[PDB]
Amino acid sequence: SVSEGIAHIHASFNNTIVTITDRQGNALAWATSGGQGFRGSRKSTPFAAQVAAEVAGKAAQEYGVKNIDVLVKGPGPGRESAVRALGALGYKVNSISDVTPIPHNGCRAPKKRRV
Amino acid sequence: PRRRVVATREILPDPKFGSQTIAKFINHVMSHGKKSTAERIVYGALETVAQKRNIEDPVAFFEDVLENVRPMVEVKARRVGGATYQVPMEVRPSRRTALAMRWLAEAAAKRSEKSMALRLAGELSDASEGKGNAMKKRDEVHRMADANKAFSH
Amino acid sequence: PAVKVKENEPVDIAIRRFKRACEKAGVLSDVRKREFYEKPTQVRKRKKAAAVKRYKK
RNA sequence: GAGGAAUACCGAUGGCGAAGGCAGCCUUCUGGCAUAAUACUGACACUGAGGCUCGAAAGCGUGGGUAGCAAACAGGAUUAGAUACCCUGGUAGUCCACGCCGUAAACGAUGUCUACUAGUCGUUGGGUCCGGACUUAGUGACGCAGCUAACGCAAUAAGUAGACCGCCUGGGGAGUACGGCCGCAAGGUUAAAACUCAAAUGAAUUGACGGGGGCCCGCACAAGCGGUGGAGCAUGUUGUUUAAU
């Protein structure tokens, strides 16, 4: 159906969400580290992102996407491992980009944890 | 230890086959410093399977079963700031043979055959095709190695 | 921080180039400062402590 | 699409302000400072009890606003308990206008103003010379003499002197009571006594310790082999019993 698409690699310290959409912003498939059998400490690992991108990428590979540009966001560890999965799955990358929300000293952050 | 790497000892090969692999396996069956008692157990077990499977040379057969038991990935215990990560790592070759030789003897000691030479013969035959506690133990280690497959530290 | 992969280029090389561009832009430096609110008094100590450290070396 | 708050980078022992404080950008009103030269007044100066003014945050009054964060509060955990730390929410407050409050480790724990006393290296705003050199007013890092119990200070003195003001007189009781004054209130300010004890303190020294750091060793752990802990008996002890055990 669609050949050009976008890969979103929204990755946090706890979980990484890898949804891949079209050029417009309509989601086609999505996978998560916590929805792949990994929970707790193993969910926040780069490998759990490697399988999440592998599952999501293969899920919409049937759609017809071959050209896709990733949009990584977040400080998580699966921001680097997930992109490697798409490259090894047969995807032809268009551009690697990092659109992370950086406030210009806006809303106040939560208080520092005393751990 | 803590500083050096002491050199490993030299082991004389078995008198009936001239192989250091069987002689090392005799060491794994022996208890109470009774070399001869373990030798007839190993020789009897090897003769039983050799006489049953019609194989002239059983040293190569023991290699086949040993390679079918040796694990390739083991799950080590690691600590990172109080957190325990059960990292799966490779097994050094000297430890591969030791683990396989250990599991065979310990799995054969809980069999139901009449004699220990017969008990060991059953496990060697069973592990040859890929069954028995020895194979089950190797899968259990590999199952735990695949269970994590996420700590590469 | 946008790296346009060129023709005939293994993603392994491309991702290395992307990681370098993100490091240059200070992407992860800013997201780490936003994890918690640093009190202005603590900011002044941290900045000055770095200032003293910088001058000594 | 609505709305509120803060203004990433620049950003800097950088700058401005008497202190408190003050960061997107633009306009308007407005204070002080820095700088070369000339002209002018001609000691008009410094300090300053009372007094007055300003004065972080929190808090209070009235009226608005309210996104994020978050006292209180609610729940989930951890725990012996957990009215906490951690997690999910969350109201006052935080924001605005006008007023109170007048307190902070409001600190450089160092009152203000003068003059003099080796030097070295930065940096901000000027200035004058020939990329440098010099000279100013700040802001720093060192380092002599000198000072200091020591730490350390050292032209931005804690040195050498002078002017005036403030304050201290063992530790608790106590910055508490009482009485004034101030405040809407919270409270603030001024400020004792009885009684009690021979100490309480500062800096540095040697150890010891740290759920501080760094390095290293030992069957210390790890990797293994064999045990003890369960049975019967031997032996020793406890206990109990005994005339004594």
Sole residue written with tokens 């000892």: B9
CA distance C53 to C57: 7
Q: What DSSP string runs through A20-67?
A: EEESSS-EEEEEESTTTT--TTTTTSHHHHHHHHHHHHHHTTTTT--E
Q: Is the CB of C37 under 7 A from strand D?
A: yes
C31 to chain A, closest Cα gap in Å? 7
Tokens, residue B82: 């109080």
Is B27 strand, coil or helix? helix
**Cα–Cα distance for residue pair B6/B94, rounded to 1 Å:** 15
Q: Is the CB of B2 under 7 A from strand D?
A: yes
The DSSP element (H or E) to which C46 belongs, if any, is helix C40-56
Q: Solved by what technique?
A: cryo-EM
Query: Do the Cβ atoms of A80 and C5 come within 8 Å?
Result: no
Cα–Cα distance between B111 and B142 in angstroms, integer? 23
User: How many interface pairs between A and B have CB atoms less than 8 angstroms apart?
Assistant: 13
Count how many Cα atoms sit within 13 Å of the Cα of residue B63 in the half-sphere of its side chain.
7
- Burial (CB < 10 A; 0-12, 13-18, 19+), residue B116, is buried
Beta-carbon contacts of residue A109 (< 8 Å; ≥ 6 apart): C34, C35, C36, C37
Of A80, A35, A25, A79, residue with least CA distance to A56: A35
Whether B84 contacts B96, CB under 8 Å: no
Residue type at position B123 = E
> How many helices, marked H, and strands, marked E, lie in chain B?
6, 4
Q: B69 φ, ψ to 5°? A: -100, -30
Distances (CA, A) of C15 to A45, B52, C18: 18, 59, 5
- How buried is residue A69: exposed, middle or buried, by Cβ count under 10 Å (0-12/13-18/19+)? middle
The whole-angstrom separation of Cα B146 and Cα B73 is 9
The reply to whether the CB atom of residue A95 sits less than 7 A from any atom in nucleic acid chain D is: no
**CB-based burial label for A16 (10 Å; 0-12, 13-18, 19+):** buried
Q: Using CA atoms, how far apart are residues B130 and A36, in angstroms rounded to an integer? A: 31
How far is it, in rounded angstroms, from Cα A87 to Cα B124? 45
Residue A90: alpha-carbon gap to chain centroid:
17
For the purposes of burial, counting CB atoms within 10 Å of the CB of B129, is it exposed (0-12), middle (13-18) or buried (19 or more)? exposed
Q: Which two tokens stand for residue A102?
A: 């950086």
- DSSP for B135-152 reads HHHHHHHHHHHHHH----
> What does this entry list as its resolution, in Å?
2.7
Side chain identity at residue B37, one-letter code = T
**Contact, B150 vs A37, CB < 8 A?**
no
Q: What contacts A79, CB < 8 A, 6 or more positions away?
A: A9, A11, A16, A49, A72
Q: Taking CB atoms and an 8 Å limit, are A84 and C15 in contact across chains? A: yes
Query: Do the Cβ atoms of B47 and B22 come closer than 8 Å?
Result: no
Distance CA C14, CA C35 (A): 29
- How far apart CA A60 and CA A68 sit, in angstroms, is 11
Chain B residues within an 8 Å CB radius of A41: 83, 85
Q: What is the DSSP pairing of strand A67-73 with strand A92-98?
A: parallel
d(CA A89, CA A83): 10
